[PDB]
């Protein structure tokens, strides 16, 4: 799963392995020269030899630092470039997934996936292979050297190594489950935090801070972190003590001093252990702290590739104008939970189709299926005779504009929000679209004018931001329009004026109107009553009233 994602970094990661092997051998070479320098320095060698060894040792230290710095610079750039490409792939993937994926997952979990999962790959793909190769090469090279020097004092170095390995294994075993539970806990707390900040007026009125679910789950998450981190940090510092250079220096002397005091060793031969033996502990600590990073990186790779393996809205090769044509459409958000049932409905150019009915019947889903935010479970939807599943997002949305139930405004200027469908539209087109939607006057009252930003906290009134979205759809100016409960939050005077503007623009266009204000849709050429996900009756306003059906019931209740 992870390897299929990280395959493009095959050659950087292999090159990182070999370069670290050479670099960590180069980093160990100075202390080999210093041992040679110390031995000749006790032997009273000529000053030329001492200066040559000393100067070379300092130069090789500089070379090692330069090469290590150049490596981590290059390897971090490679990781940064891969993450940008991977995030670009995820954004392109999410641009064509079914829209139920977002609804059941949430925006918080999407935030973890795009940004924090790709960031969790860091230690795996830039630090893991160097740290592992260093901990394999340098301790082996040092211990081989010291076993050549003296086996008695080289054997005691297995004591801190064995204790470190035991601590490393039990640490990873103990924290393995928690590292797997961690990403979902972060998703949950991300969800709670987003709801806490977005749903602030509900928190202020209903229960305040203490009664909020966020504080309950915040305590639960911190309790999880404490249980995860206390034994983990406890083991993590015991390893730090075991592999510290001071620990190696002490245990070397404990094993060496009783020998040297006796006639069993020459103190000249303790020099390698003091100089080489203390240095390879810090490199063991690398993977000692990095196993958790590798575990997190592998799990993040699995989540990322799982989403990149997710099924998406394909664009088939199967391959009147202005017509929309639903042909025995059926749809279910959850399998076994139908919401549309055998609906047949043809929208023709130069007509207005009013899709009314009880709340929760399925009207907004049927508008969504015309948008192809989801795929029908049965039947087909055809635009200009071309099935929407054979149309790319470009071709499909060239032909059908939308005003959605929720007035979702993106963070940006008002001209950007109106020009969302066509950012390169001239300002004069934007002002005419706003005048039609009866929102240009309010925009001129704003401080900055059209450039004023509509982020949350600098928002507009409910009816006003709805009129902005109506202005957006008018600017798109598609052959087909779908007015999913426009004028819901508008007053009767604004509602009448925007409807007049819409009825002026869309005389040679296909219009689908979803309205609970039944008095606004009496002019429709066809009034479709959608109840329980199935069309219960069809006709004009006068015909439906005379029929005494469901529409008569809704009409009478409206008085």
Partner 1 sequence: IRTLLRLVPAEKRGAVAGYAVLTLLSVLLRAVGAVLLIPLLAALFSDTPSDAWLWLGWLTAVTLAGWVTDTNTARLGFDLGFAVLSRTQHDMADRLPNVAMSWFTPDNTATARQAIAATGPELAGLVVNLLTPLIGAALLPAAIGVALLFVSVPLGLAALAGVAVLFGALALSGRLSRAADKVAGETNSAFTERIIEFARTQQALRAARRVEPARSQVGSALAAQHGAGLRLLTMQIPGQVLFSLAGQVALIGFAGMAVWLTVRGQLGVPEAIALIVVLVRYLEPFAAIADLAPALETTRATLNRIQAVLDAPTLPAGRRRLDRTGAAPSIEFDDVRFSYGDEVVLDGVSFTLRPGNTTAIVGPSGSGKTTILSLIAGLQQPASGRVLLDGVDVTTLDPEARRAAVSVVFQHPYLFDGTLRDNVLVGDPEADPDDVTAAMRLARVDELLDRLPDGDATVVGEGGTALSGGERQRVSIARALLKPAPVLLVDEATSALDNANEAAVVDALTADPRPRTRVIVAHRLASIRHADRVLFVEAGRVVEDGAIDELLAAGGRFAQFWA
Which segments are annotated as binding site for ATP? Answer: 357-364
Q: Rank residues 3 and 84 by Cβ distance to partner 1 and give the closer one.
A: 84
Q: Binding segment for partner 1 among 130-138, 143-151, 210-218, 539-547 (CB under 8 A)?
A: 210-218
Which of residues 1 and 554 has its CB atom nearest to partner 1 in the complex? 554
Residues 314 and 97 sit within 8 Å (Cβ to Cβ): no
Q: How far is the CB of 461 from Mg ion (least distance, A)?
A: 6
Cα 356 to Cα 279: distance, rounded to the nearest angstrom: 78
Picked from Mg ion, partner 1, none, the partner binding residue 191 (CB below 5 to 8 A depending on kind) is partner 1
Cα 190 to Cα 94, 245, 427: the distances in Å are 19, 41, 39
SS (HEC) of 147-215: HHHCHHHHHCCHHHHHHHHHHHHHHHHHHHHHHHHHHHHHHHHHHHHHHHHHCHHHHHHCCCCCCCHHH
448 binds partner 1 (CB under 8 A): no
User: CB of 400 within 8 A of CB of 324?
Assistant: yes
Binding segment toward partner 1, per CB under 8 A, in 6-14, 319-327, 427-435, 457-465? 457-465
Question: Cα(292)–Cα(235) distance, rounded to whole angstroms?
Answer: 12
Beta pairing class for 526-531 and 480-484: unpaired
**Residues 37-66 close enough to bind partner 1 by CB under 8 A:** 38, 41-42, 54, 58, 61-62, 65-66
Q: Phi and psi at residue 312, in whole multiples of 5°?
A: -130, 175
Interface of this chain with partner 1, residues 121 to 180, rule: CB under 8 A: none
In the three-class reduction of DSSP (H, G, I as helix; E, B as strand; rest coil), residue 91 is classed as: helix
Closest approach, Cβ 462 to partner 1, in A, equals 5
> Is position 358 an interface residue for Mg ion (rule: CB under 5 A)?
no
Provide the mask over 506-535, with x wherever binding to partner 1 is found by CB under 8 A and - wherever it is not. Answer: ----------xxx-----------------
b/e per residue, 506-530, with b = 16+ CB within 10 A?
beebbbbbbbbbbebbeebebbbbb
Q: Within 356-395, which residues bind partner 1 (CB under 8 A)?
A: 356-360, 364, 368, 371, 373, 393-394
* Minimum distance from residue 358 beta carbon to partner 1 (Å): 5
Site stretch for partner 1 (CB under 8 A), options 124-132, 211-219, 298-306, 380-388: 211-219
Nearer residue to Mg ion within complex by CB, 271 or 367? 367
Closest by Cα among 436, 443, 395, 398 to 416:
443
Query: Quick one: which segment of 6-14, 383-391, 416-424, 535-543 binds partner 1 (CB under 8 A)?
Result: 416-424
Distance (Å, whole) CA 69 – CA 43: 37
Length reported for the chain = 559
Residue 492 contact, options Mg ion, partner 1, none, Cβ 5-8 Å cut-off depending on partner type: partner 1
Residues between 476 and 505 with contacts to partner 1, criterion CB under 8 A: 476, 485, 488-495
SS (H, E, C) 195-209: HHHHCHHHHHHCCCC
Which of 405, 452, 522, 526 binds Mg ion (CB under 5 A)? It is: 405
Distance CA 350, CA 511 (A): 8
- The interface with partner 1 within residues 213-242 (CB under 8 A) comprises 213-215, 218, 221-222, 225-226, 228-230, 233-234, 237-238, 240-241
Q: Should residue 253 be labelled a site residue for partner 1 when binding is judged by CB under 8 A?
A: yes
Residue 319 binding: pick among Mg ion, partner 1, none (C-beta 5-8 Å cut-off by kind): none
Question: Beta partners for 356?
Answer: 529
Q: Which of residues 460-479 bind Mg ion (CB under 5 A)?
A: 462
Vertex 376 angle, CA 375 and 379, to 5°:
135
**Distance of closest approach, residue 426 Cβ to partner 1, in angstroms:** 17
Query: Of these partners, partner 1, Mg ion, none, which one is at the site of residue 203 (CB under 5 to 8 Å by kind)?
Result: partner 1
**261 is in the binding site of which of partner 1, Mg ion, none (Cβ under 5 to 8 A by kind)?**
partner 1
* Burial (CB count <10 Å: 0-12, 13-18, 19+), residue 140: exposed
Q: Which residue in 40, 102, 132, 156 binds partner 1 (CB under 8 A)?
A: 102
Burial of 389 (0-12, 13-18, 19+ CB in 10 A): middle
Residues in region 426-465 near Mg ion by CB under 5 A: 462
Under the binding rule (CB under 5 A), the answer on residue 516 touching Mg ion is no
- Site for Mg ion, rule CB under 5 A: 364, 405, 462
């Amino acid at each position: 799963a992870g390897s299929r994602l990280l395959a493009p970094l095959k050659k950087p990661l292999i090159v990182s392995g070999v370069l670290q092997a050479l670099i960590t051998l180069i980093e160990l070479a100075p202390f080999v020269l210093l041992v040679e320098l110390a031995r000749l320095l006790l032997g009273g060698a000529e000053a030329e030899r001492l200066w040559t060894l000393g100067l070379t040792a300092v130069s090789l230290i500089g070379l090692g630092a330069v090469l290590a710095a150049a490596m981590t610079l290059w390897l971090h750039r490679v990781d940064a470039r891969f993450a940008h490409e991977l995030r670009g792939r995820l954004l392109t993937k999410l641009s064509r997934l079914p829209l139920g994926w977002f609804t059941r997952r949430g925006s918080a979990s999407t935030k973890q996936l795009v940004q924090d999962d790709t960031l969790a790959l860091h230690y795996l793909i830039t630090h893991a292979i160097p740290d592992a190769v260093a901990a394999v090469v340098a301790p082996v090279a040092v211990l081989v050297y010291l076993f050549v020097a003296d086996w008695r004092v080289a054997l005691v170095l297995f004591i801190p190594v064995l204790v470190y390995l035991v601590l490393m294994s039990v640490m990873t075993i103990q924290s393995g489950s928690k590292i797997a539970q961690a990403p979902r806990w972060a998703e949950r707390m991300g969800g709670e935090a987003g709801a806490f900040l977005e749903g602030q007026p509900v928190i202020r009125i209903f229960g305040g801070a203490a009664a909020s679910r966020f504080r309950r789950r915040l305590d639960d998450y911190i309790d999880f972190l404490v249980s995860w981190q206390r034994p983990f940090v406890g083991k993590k510092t015991l390893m730090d003590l075991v592999t510290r250079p001071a620990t190696f220096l002490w245990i070397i002397l404990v094993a060496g001093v009783p020998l040297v005091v006796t006639g069993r060793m020459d103190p000249v031969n303790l020099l390698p252990f003091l100089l080489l033996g203390t240095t390879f502990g810090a490199r063991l600590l690398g993977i000692g702290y990095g196993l958790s990073g590798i575990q997190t990186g592998m799990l993040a790779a699995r989540r990322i590739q799982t989403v990149l393996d997710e099924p998406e809205l394909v664009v088939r090769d199967r391959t009147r104008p202005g017509t929309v044509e639903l042909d025995r459409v059926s749809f279910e958000y959850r399998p076994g939970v139908p919401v549309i049932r055998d609906v047949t409905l043809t929208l023709r150019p130069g007509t207005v189709t009013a899709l009314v009915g009880p709340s929760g019947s399925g009207k907004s889903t049927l508008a969504a299926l015309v948008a192809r935010f989801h795929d029908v479970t049965q039947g087909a939807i055809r635009v200009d005779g071309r099935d929407i599943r054979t149309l790319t997002a470009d071709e499909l949305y060239r032909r059908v504009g939308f005003v959605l139930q929720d007035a979702q405004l993106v963070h940006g200027s008002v001209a950007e929000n109106i020009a969302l469908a066509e950012p390169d539209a001239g300002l004069e087109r934007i002002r005419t679209a706003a005048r039609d939607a009866q929102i240009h006057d309010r925009i001129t009252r704003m401080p900055d004018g059209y450039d004023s930003v509509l982020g949350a906290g600098s928002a507009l009134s409910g009816g006003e931001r709805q009129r902005v979205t109506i202005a957006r759809a008018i600017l798109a100016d598609t052959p087909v329009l779908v007015l999913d409960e426009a004028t819901a939050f508008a007053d009767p005077e604004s509602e009448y004026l925007v409807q007049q503007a819409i009825n002026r623009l869309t005389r040679d266009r296909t219009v689908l109107v979803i309205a609970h204000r039944l008095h606004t849709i009496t002019h429709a050429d066809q009034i479709v009553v959608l109840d329980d996900g199935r069309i219960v009756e069809v006709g004009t306003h006068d015909e439906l009233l005379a029929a005494g059906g469901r529409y008569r019931g809704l009409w009478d209740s409206g008085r």
